[PDB]
């Protein structure tokens, strides 16, 4: 069934109010359906897409004046990246990747994440076999999923 997609105002209601570190963790992972933000076409629909969170949620809210989001999302990423949990580390990497790709398109952003500690935590996690293997597998999955989308367009 066609459903009307979520409006800009839909995200505004979630992000122009008190938002805690813990809320931000739950949004960025999005395993809990109540905090799950995704694009229509996206690898692993049971998990959220940080790029949609940044582009349509956090950055508009920050510009409006909710500028505590910067330090709080930093703390959120700090805790996710030092958690020893593969999926939490993956969404932290995916959030860093999203900033980069958005920076490259827009040529500026309303704020820049302090990424050194987070990056340091990710490298520590990469030393662990299970973590880096789980992350390789997610990464390879995302490639396969994108390639399957290119196939359909070839068919048409």
From TrEMBL:
Cited InterPro entries: IFS, IFS_sf
A Pfam family this chain is assigned to: IFS
Organism superkingdom: Bacteria
Protein name per its UniProtKB record: Immunity factor for SPN
Organism for this UniProt entry: Streptococcus pyogenes
């Amino acid at each position: 069934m066609y459903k009307v997609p979520k409006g800009l105002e839909h995200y505004q209601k979630m992000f122009q109010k008190e938002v805690t570190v813990n809320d931000l963790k739950k949004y960025l992972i999005g395993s809990d359906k109540e905090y799950r933000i995704t694009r229509r076409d996206s690898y692993m629909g049971d998990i959220s897409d940080p790029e949609v969170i940044l582009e349509y949620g956090v950055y508009p809210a920050f510009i409006k004046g909710y500028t505590q989001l910067k330090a709080n999302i930093e703390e959120a990423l700090l805790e996710m990246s030092n958690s020893g949990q593969a999926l939490d580390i993956y969404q932290a990497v995916q959030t860093l990747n999203a900033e980069n790709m958005l920076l490259n398109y827009y040529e500026s952003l309303p704020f820049y994440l302090n990424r050194q500690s987070i990056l340091a935590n990710i490298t520590k996690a990469l030393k662990d076999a299970h973590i880096r293997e789980a992350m390789a597998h997610y990464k390879l999955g995302e490639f396969a999923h994108y390639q399957d989308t290119m196939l359909d367009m070839v068919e048409r």
